[PDB]
Design a protein around this ligand. Structure first.
Ligand SMILES: Nc1ncnc2c1ncn2[C@@H]1O[C@H](COP(=O)(O)OP(=O)(O)O)[C@@H](O)[C@H]1O
Ligand SMILES: [Mg+2]
Length: 323
């Protein structure tokens, strides 16, 4: 299968943000290069420009609907039996949740809408599809069910190349509206909101799993594909001088994730040593990563000079992958 990396620059914050000490420049997509380039410069030293290439770059103009236009084609693949992974990577505040979960806008919401659209359309070709979904968070390497109102163990099935988690609430999606309630919950909890709880969310990975089961009599065919939409824990480098535990956790979690992606993109990713088991995340997702699977990595960045440094890390992490 294939791997891709997008960069998304969010618009600046009305008051507490500026770019007087830094400069981000994005160039127009090219063929000869078949990439899109960007440029990052720190004022303190204008002779050192950091270049970064990607599959695609979204700036402050591209809205959420603007982004899905590029993502819809990837998602559709599940109707064909492929598994898909989508990760939002970046520092707290870069806009990861916004991109994933923004009401009606988000990758998740849009993704759902999009499949139904197709499902409803495939009925004519003799296809009947069923959709189920799970919603958990990985926090300190422990699995947590975000759909409950309990020990969870990962079951991998090699006959099927499918995975399951014990004791995890699963939900039937017969319509967009069905999830749409949860999706509210979800976003608010992760908001700047007074009562919300981002301190925790910031420190954790939230995973939205979706499974499409399709069968067709007039062909007698079957299709099964899983989509994993990841709202990664904040990537901010912490000085480090519980919270320490929480810290180390993340680092290995992200690093591992980066090791794994990079390896999958290598020309000899077959019998290459891939740290799947190194983290709960990659362990959980190995089937949605290996083989024919499609992975999209989204790198979220802030445009203000105030984060120029994390911004650099973020692009380095991204860069490492794509290579
Ligand atoms: N593309 C975007 N356009 C408009 N506002 C955005 C965008 N990305 C993020 N924001 C705003 O930026 C703030 C931080 O976004 P958020 O998703 O919570 O960050 P993160 O999840 O990376 O910690 C929010 O108030 C959000 O509304
Ligand atoms: Mg968030």
């Amino acid at each position: 299968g294939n791997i891709r990396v997008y960069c998304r620059i969010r618009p600046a914050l009305k008051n507490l943000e500026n770019s007087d000490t830094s400069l981000i420049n994005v160039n127009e997509f090219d063929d000869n290069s078949g990439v899109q380039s960007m440029e990052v410069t720190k004022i303190q030293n204008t002779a050192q420009v950091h270049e970064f290439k990607f599959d695609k770059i979204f700036d402050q103009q591209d809205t959420n609907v603007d982004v899905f236009k590029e993502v819809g084609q990837l998602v559709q693949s599940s109707l064909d039996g492929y598994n898909v992974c989508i990760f939002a990577y970046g520092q707290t505040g870069s806009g990861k949740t916004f991109t994933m979960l923004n009401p009606g806008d988000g990758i998740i919401p849009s993704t759902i809408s999009h499949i139904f659209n197709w499902i409803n359309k495939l009925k004519t070709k003799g296809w009947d599809y069923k959709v189920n979904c799970e919603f958990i968070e990985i926090y300190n390497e422990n699995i947590v069910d975000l759909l409950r109102s309990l020990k969870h163990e990962i079951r991998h099935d090699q006959e099927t190349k499918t995975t399951t988690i014990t004791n995890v609430t699963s939900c039937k999606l017969e319509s967009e509206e069905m999830v749409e309630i949860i999706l509210k919950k979800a976003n608010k909890l992760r908001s700047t909101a007074s009562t919300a709880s981002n301190e925790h969310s910031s420190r954790s990975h939230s995973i939205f799993i979706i499974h499409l089961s399709g069968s067709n009599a007039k062909t007698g065919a079957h299709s099964y594909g899983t989509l994993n939409l990841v709202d990664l824990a904040g990537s901010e480098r912490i000085n480090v001088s519980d919270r320490l535990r929480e810290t180390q956790n993340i680092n290995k979690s992200l690093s591992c994730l980066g090791d794994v992606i990079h390896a999958l993109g290598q020309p000899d990713s077959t019998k290459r040593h891939i740290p799947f088991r190194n983290s709960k995340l990659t362990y959980l997702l190995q089937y949605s990563l290996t083989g024919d699977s499609k992975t999209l990595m989204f790198v979220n960045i802030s445009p203000s000079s105030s984060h120029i440094n994390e911004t650099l890390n973020s692009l380095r992490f991204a860069s490492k992958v794509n290579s």
